[PDB]
Amino acid sequence: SMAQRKKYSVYGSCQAPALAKMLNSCPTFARDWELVEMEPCFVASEEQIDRHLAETIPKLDLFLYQPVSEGYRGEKYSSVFLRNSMPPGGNALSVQYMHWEGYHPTVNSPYGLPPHPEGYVDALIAGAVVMDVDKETYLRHLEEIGASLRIDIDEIESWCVDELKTREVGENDGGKQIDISVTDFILANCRQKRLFYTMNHPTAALMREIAARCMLALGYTYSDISFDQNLDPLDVTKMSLYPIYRDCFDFSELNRMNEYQVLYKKKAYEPYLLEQFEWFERSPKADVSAFFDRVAANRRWVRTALRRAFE
Ligand SMILES: *SCCNC(=O)CCNC(=O)[C@H](O)C(C)(C)COP(=O)(O)OP(=O)(O)OC[C@H]1O[C@@H](n2cnc3c(N)ncnc32)[C@H](O)[C@@H]1OP(=O)(O)O
Ligand SMILES: [Cl-]
Ligand SMILES: [Cl-]
Ligand SMILES: [Cl-]
Ligand SMILES: [Cl-]
């Protein structure tokens, strides 16, 4: 019934609690399923993950999860190890980890550098710092950078799709193919609808879409699927598209590059980008260079933009 709904959990990145929130907002889903919450992979403590292996997972009818490698934090947090503890007759369905750099091709997260309080940094700025390009020069060249990215938009999108398709194979989930994905949807809609606020924070529209695919995988009909349209669980931070590049997107509005939102606060694009320079200049140059090299290695358009703007 209702006090006798089946039990499910959602484990994975920050997208996992967001997906549970979205699913719970569908009355037909909520009629059948009761959430038992699991902390996501980046925050679960050892005590918490131990408890979930012992007490949560063996009681689930459904484990919706994103692939998480053993190398991330250890076996205990890995999707292979967690799903192994499911009871007989339980169902474990993998859900795509949604990552897409196509709106903000200059943005990534620190590797080998201190964590940034906002979680994201502009990697092209890191390259400029290494190249001894001054912050004022960079700010005067935003259009040249955006023009380069615009010329390269198809290459960028092709790579973004390939990264998702490669991950569908599930190497970080013991070689199990990902059950539930939205790759074709993302490519087909990305220029028409804003699908990501940051590379790994889907907007409401994308969260609804993936939640819908989960419901289809569970055997619900298309007509069963409806969500709270006001839910936008990953809206904390909103990266701004660069000038010129932004005009490739149907939704693009204000001010020659929009303000950023970071941790729910608005920040004008000029001070935001100047502060990125200041942040990188605090770290050892060798480490900033290692970071930029790591980002640029498989992202041709990044070095191309730096060269076209600053050579
Ligand atoms: S909801 C956003 C919360 N943020 C995070 O969890 C931090 C960023 N994500 C990750 O570190 C990983 O994606 C997690 C969730 C821990 C899973 O890690 P795995 O070891 O299982 O494997 P991944 O392939 O998911 O991650 C490895 C690196 O690859 C980046 N990444 C994932 N997906 C893509 C796509 N499609 N394109 C490019 N890069 C992608 C991850 O961010 C991660 O980056 P590193 O810089 O190597 O940490
Ligand atoms: Cl059971
Ligand atoms: Cl799809
Ligand atoms: Cl924008
Ligand atoms: Cl060229």
Residue numbers in the entry: 1 to 311
What is written in the article reporting this PDB entry?
Here, the crystal structure of WcbI bound to its proposed product, coenzyme A, is reported at 1.38 Å resolution, solved using the halide-soak method with multiple anomalous dispersion. Analysis of early crystals of WcbI revealed that an unidentified ligand had been partially retained with the protein from expression in E. coli through the purification process. We therefore co-crystallized WcbI with acetyl-CoA. A second crystal was obtained co-crystallized with substrate acetyl-CoA, and high-resolution complex data were collected. The structure of the CoA complex of WcbI and the native structure were refined by PHENIX and CCP4, respectively, to resolutions of 1.38 and 1.56 Å, respectively. Co-crystallization with 200 µM acetyl-CoA led to almost complete occupancy of the ligand, with all CoA ligand atoms visible in the density. Although there is low occupancy of the acetyl group in the structure, the functional groups of acetyl-CoA form an extensive set of interactions with the protein, supporting the premise that this is a bona fide ligand of WcbI. Furthermore, the acetyl moiety is held in place through hydrogen bonds to Cys14 and His201, constraining its conformation and presenting the acetyl group in a suitable orientation for reaction. Soaks with acetyl-CoA reveal that the CoA head, and likely the acetyl group, are held between cysteine and histidine side chains from opposite sides of the cradle in a conformation suggestive for reaction. The two structures of WcbI presented here, obtained under different conditions, suggest that WcbI allows some flexibility in the CoA head group.
